[PDB]
């Protein structure tokens, strides 16, 4: 490990609301979440093995690593990595306790 | 714009329930949350600028930075740092939506 003071600052974490969720034909993990980072809009595909319905995701405010990756080499539309809390088996989504505005810069 | 796969795995984050919140005699920084990472109990001085009640804290599941916090400011032996979904206007701490047991990771 290392004193991640500067390291954390480098990890531009922003909260965004999922405007909607696209879906593909057949292929699972089709959760193409349209994250609204305030003024910016980016697509990120979420796996979440049948643990979270797209309906509930609509309007859900999640924290995503903005400056992570603009595109995933494997074609998967991922303009940022969504922070998923992988419990002993349950994939919980990271969401703030109360109403937080879009583009929320963590610090 | 970096390989957010390897670096991500390195920074193993863990979820735990706050047992209690220690307070010092008098300082503009309190809430030494005794976060029990499943079987391990660590000391995390989550100052949280008077944003949370010591009462509601007892049982609250928060995500903490594990093997990435070897040392902290003033040398305070804080084994771990709590990820707060800050937005300037406020310091909304991260807490999982669906209730799950401890020992939860991040992936």
Q: Round the Cα radius of gyration of chain A to an integer and report it.
A: 14 Å
CATH topology call of chain A: OB fold (Dihydrolipoamide Acetyltransferase, E2P)
Multimer state: homodimer
Element order, helices and strands of chain A?
HEEEHEEEEE
Number of structurally distinct domains of chain A: 1
Count of alpha and pi helical runs of chain A: 2
Please estimate the helix content of chain A: under 10%
Q: What percent of residues of chain A are in strands?
A: 35-45%
Number of strands of chain A: 8
Q: Could you name the CATH homologous superfamily of chain A?
A: Nucleic acid-binding proteins
* Secondary-structure-derived class of chain A: mainly beta
The main sheet of chain A comes to: 6 strands, antiparallel
CATH C-level class of chain A? Mainly Beta
Terminal-residue CA separation of chain A: 20 Å
Largest interface: A-B, 35 and 37 residues
Key traits:
homodimer; 107 residues; mainly beta; OB fold (Dihydrolipoamide Acetyltransferase, E2P); six-stranded antiparallel beta sheet; two-stranded antiparallel sheet; 8 strands; globular; rna binding protein; oligonucleotide; oligosaccharide-binding fold
Give a structural overview.
The structure is a homodimer of 107-residue chains. Chain A has 107 residues and is mainly β. Chain A has one domain (1-107): Nucleic acid-binding proteins (OB fold (Dihydrolipoamide Acetyltransferase, E2P), Beta Barrel), CATH 2.40.50. Chain A is 9% helix and 39% strand. Chain A has helices spanning 5-10, 54-57, and strands at 13-22, 31-37, 40-46, 61-65, 81-82, 84-86, 91-96, 104-105. In chain A, strands 1, 2, 3, 4, 5 and 8 form a six-stranded antiparallel sheet that branches. The longest helix of chain A is centred in the first third of the chain and has 6 residues, at 5-10. The two termini of chain A are 20 Å apart. Chains A and B meet through strand 6, strand 7 and strand 8 of A and strand 6 and strand 7 of B. Strand 7 (91-96) of chain A pairs antiparallel with strand 7 (91-96) of chain B.
